[PDB]
């Protein structure tokens, strides 16, 4: 039958000194299976369920590398949004991202997700057609404009269409 995989990433800037608080959590069907936390004693990806401990050590290392990579991405783009919305340098803000795939019974992609939110408001999201973007406001249109010119929709669609579906298949087997 149908299956799904979702990843939720959130970065929250803090007043005062200190980098943003970043968190990443993944879900299979609707069960948390992986999690990363920047404010952890040992920041790294870790299994949340027994059937995830069967992944090689190198699996969790390179995947934790993506975390650090994603974390820096959220750091740089939190600053970009402060300028787009002309916000005071003194405040807390949260940039969020959700991405994933739903797979039908035939094993093929049923629906793909790639959407971002800023301070609890939708910013930009990949439409179900996986070809166009919905830009909530004028600031989002700056991003959408540059993403249409760079063919970002196809880029993300490639992942959702292949890797997302393939890894969901693997996880379900284990």
């Amino acid at each position: 039958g149908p299956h799904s995989m979702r990843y939720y990433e959130t970065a929250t800037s803090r007043r005062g000194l200190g980098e943003p608080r970043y968190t990443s959590v993944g879900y299979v069907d609707d069960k948390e299976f992986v999690r990363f936390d920047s404010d952890a004693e040992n920041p790294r990806y870790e299994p949340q369920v027994p059937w995830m401990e069967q992944e090689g050590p190198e699996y969790w290392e390179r995947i934790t590398q993506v975390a650090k990579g994603q974390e820096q991405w959220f750091r740089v783009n939190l600053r970009t949004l402060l300028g787009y919305y002309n916000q005071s340098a003194g405040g807390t803000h949260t940039l969020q991202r959700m991405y994933g795939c739903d797979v039908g019974s035939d094993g093929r992609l049923l629906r793909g997700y790639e959407q971002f939110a800023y301070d609890g408001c939708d910013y930009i999201a990949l439409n179900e057609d996986l070809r166009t973007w919905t830009a909530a406001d004028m600031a989002a249109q700056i991003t959408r404009r540059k993403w249409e010119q760079a063919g970002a929709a196809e880029y993300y669609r490639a992942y959702l269409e292949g890797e997302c579906v393939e890894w969901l298949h693997r996880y379900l087997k284990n």
Binding site: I63, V66, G69, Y99, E114, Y123, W147, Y159, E163, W167
Partner: peptide, 9 residues
């Protein structure tokens, strides 16, 4: 596996 790094906003 995780998706590739997204383009910049």
């Amino acid at each position: 596996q995780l998706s590739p790094f997204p383009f910049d906003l």
